[PDB]
Amino acid sequence: TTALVCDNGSGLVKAGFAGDDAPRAVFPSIVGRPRSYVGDEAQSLTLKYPIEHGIITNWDDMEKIWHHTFYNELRVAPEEHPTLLTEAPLNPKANREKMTQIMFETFNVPAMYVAIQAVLSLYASGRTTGIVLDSGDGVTHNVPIYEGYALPHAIMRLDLAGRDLTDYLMKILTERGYSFVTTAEREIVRDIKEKLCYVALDFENEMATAASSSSLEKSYELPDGQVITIGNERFRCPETLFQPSFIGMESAGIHETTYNSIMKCDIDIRKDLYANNVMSGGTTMYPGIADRMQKEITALAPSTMKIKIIAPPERKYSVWIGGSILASLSTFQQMWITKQEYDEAGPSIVH
């Protein structure tokens, strides 16, 4: 009867037991029907993603992901463990309610809790005050947190993330004559992204180094043993997070939304936010991204202001780890919504 921690990503589900240092299970958030299998069963034609931009969008299929999570991955009975699930910042009320109803009525959990992904990242780093940039496969967010509360009026949403960056990598790879096009091939590209991409410190200088030197070039070996070479594609692709126009979007880039987000906060707490920039999510893993953030918010912030970027090596997992820490805590045990409270109050209680 240990608490379970489930982080519902657009791309990866992360699940395990509270107290543990790492998630027991990390599998694709996918349901495959042929011509239903969940997660790993599924990748082994016709995959649905139940979570879109951090929001649960297909409930029937979310129900199957949860079921696989408990019964296949974690090997537990859900009526036997308090379960903590995460959500996206600015998750609609009806959503949190449906999530809550499902847990209680379909899975009969004894108790559950819903936490904001980015808050847990912050916790993971041993902080209660800071601003998290959380950037996954489906959405990017800035969430300022003060003394452990998220400040929902100051939350900024950039709707581009890991998935869009792969897609953009597929398109630019065609300049050198490589064609990546299908679902399968997009997975090869996601791999190229994760091994070879990086954030330039100074984009236009990096473009000019690329143009006059072959020094930025890197080879990659495909599944069929063919070798390709990329150059400026390595940093054009994640430059998109600083310049969403690259992929036709009107959005401010992540340096700018970090600043806007701080600027929506009471002026007397900005010092603490600028000194506690936590990066989390798989899409903050690029080499150079920390450096580029630092340079970029230092150009926006007051000139006396101390800027620090925090970027844990394990930040693809911060969220789950924050949940594992949180749900571990003695003082936290009272915070669980129990079945008994649920029978009294209906899904509302989650508020």
Binding site: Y123, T128, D268, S330
Partner: peptide, 28 residues
């Protein structure tokens, strides 16, 4: 351990305390 985190969480202001400082919007 984030014994660090449980210390910080005990020593934190009330939601109400922050609403009244002007830091939080109130839950409506």
């Amino acid at each position: 351990r984030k014994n660090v985190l449980q210390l910080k969480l005990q020593q934190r202001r009330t939601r109400e305390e922050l609403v009244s400082q002007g830091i939080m919007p109130p839950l409506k």
